[PDB]
Structures are given as C-alpha cells and as structure tokens.
C-alpha cells in the first residue's frame with residue numbers, strides 16, 4: 365500500500381521488513397511505540413545488530429507521518445560517533461518502522477538518577493570529563509554542519525552499553541547555514557531552565573546558546589540530575605537568568621567542572637567557549653578510544 369513512507373524517504377534508507385525482528389517493548393515514543401530488537405545486515409560487517417525499532421501505526425494522520433519522516437530525514441545527514449545514528453527505515457509495510465542504533469542504558473537523565481542512594485556524590489571527575497567530552501564532540505559536529513540543537517539536555521542524550529554518551533533527540537534542531545541563528549516566531553515549548561538568557565529575551569538561538577545548554581547538562585551530570593534552579597518557579601527562573609543569575613556550584617563538585625560551567629554561562633554569548641575549544645581543554649583526559657572515533661580528531665574537522 366502507498367503511503368507517505370513511500371515518497372518522503374530516499375529508498376536508500378530502506379530495509380526489508382523481514383530483516384527486522386522486534387523483541388520486547390522499550391517504551392512510548394513521540395510518534396509511536398519503541399521496541400528493542402535485531403536488524404540483520406544493516407551495519408557493515410555485522411550479520412546482526414541490536415537496534416531500537418519505532419512503529420508508526422495506521423492510526424496516525426498523514427500530517428503526523430510526514431512530519432515524523434522529515435524529522436528522521438535530518439538525522440540521515442549526521443554520521444558521528446557521538447550522535448545516535450539512524451540505521452534505516454522500513455517503508456513498504458503497514459506499520460512504518462524506523463531503525464535506530466540501540467542505546468542499552470537509555471537517557472542520560474535516567475542514568476544519572478540511577479546512581480543515587482534511594483531517597484550524594486557525583487561520578488568521578490574522570491567519568492564526568494568523558495561524558496562532557498563525548499557530548500561536546502557530538503555538538504561540535506552539529507555546529508560544524510550548521511545546526512542548532514536548541515534542546516540540549518541530559519534527557520536528550522543516550523548512554524550506550526559501554527557507557528558512551530551520545531546526542532540523541534533532534535525534533536527541535538534547526539538549520540543555520542546563512543544567518544547563523546534561528547529566531548522563534550510564535551509559542552515555544554522548550555524548557556526555560558536550559559535556555560540561554562538571550563534565548564529567553566529575543567527567541568534567538570545560536571551555537572552560543574547551545575554551549576549555554578551544555579553548561580546546564582554539565583550541572584545535571586554533577587548533581588545526578590537535579591532540577592536546575594530548584595526552588596524557583598518558571599516565572600522566577602525566567603527573571604533570574606535574564607538578569608544574570610547563575611546556578612550554584614554543586615556541593616561535591618570538583619572546581620574544574622564548575623569553572624567549565626561558568627565559562628559556558630558567560631552572559632555575552634560571544635564570550636563563551638566553542639564546542640571545539642571545550643574539547644581541547646580536556647582532550648588529554650579522554651579515554652584512549654576517543655582519538656579514533658571522535659569528530660574532533662577527524663578529517664572532516666579543519
């Protein structure tokens with residue numbers, strides 16, 4: 365049967381519904397239900413791969429479907445070791461399938477919460493630098509390809525079986541080749557606690573604002589996923605941040621990681637570090653594998 369899937373996805377991202385086997389439910393997803401499972405011959409040199417599978421059911425408007433596909437279409441553009449990668453979509457069938465790289469340990473937020481005692485030290489500075497570095501790497505790729513994530517936060521990063529952290533959710537990211545910015549016209553649903561002052565004020569999003577968010581996820585990592593500006597309301601956070609407010613250094617936070625935050629929170633966007641700069645300052649503290657797999661140390665980067 366002919367559906368949006370047939371036109372809106374290059375058949376060069378297609379894979380036979382027979383190659384894809386679903387096992388158990390992982391959870392709800394933006395446009396359908398996500399399943400863990402296996403995808404034969406989708407990864408070069410793998411006879412089999414573990415993957416996450418999303419199912420869009422007939423019971424979803426064509427509008428719904430089209431947008432959903434277009435969102436995935438941007439994914440396609442990205443090929444970075446620290447971005448969750450799209451493995452392909454099954455388009456000739458009754459429930460459209462999207463096949464993503466499996467991240468066995470789920471979202472960085474939940475993962476961080478799992479480290480707490482049971483209703484409060486943070487990971488070791490070394491574990492933390494690795495996360496910070498792997499997140500910064502993905503973002504630097506994003507920015508090199510002229511995108512603004514807009515929605516960077518612990519809840520949007522995934523953690524792989526080997527504890528590698530990757531950027532994961534791009535429903536909110538925009539193209540910025542020419543302009544180097546995105547301006548929000550109407551109502552926005554982005555959480556205010558991750559938003560840069562300039563973004564709260566004008567609706568402007570740049571890579572400088574991404575770096576601001578990055579600081580906040582460093583803060584989330586440090587506090588094992590506390591709510592930023594706890595004790596303030598969205599109202600007060602708004603006011604507080606725009607007028608120069610800053611998150612307090614976590615109790616138990618190694619100075620270094622909080623210095624890094626304080627630079628990502630420079631009020632003047634132009635005074636913040638680039639994702640490349642950030643990586644540079646800690647690249648010598650990253651587990652060996654990094655050099656091989658990172659975008660920082662890749663050909664694309666120069």
Ligand SMILES: COc1cc2c(Nc3ccc(Sc4nccn4C)c(Cl)c3)c(C#N)cnc2cc1OCCCN(C)CCO
Nearest residue numbers: 390391398416417418436448462464465466467468469470
């Ligand atoms: C918890 O649910 C999970 C969702 C995942 C996921 N999500 C996902 C999101 C969107 C799509 S399709 C889509 N919709 C909009 C855009 N796109 C591409 C797909 Cl296919 C998967 C992707 C990925 N990616 C990769 N890995 C995942 C692992 C999950 O859990 C296993 C461990 C949890 N665990 C049990 C923790 C301990 O309890």
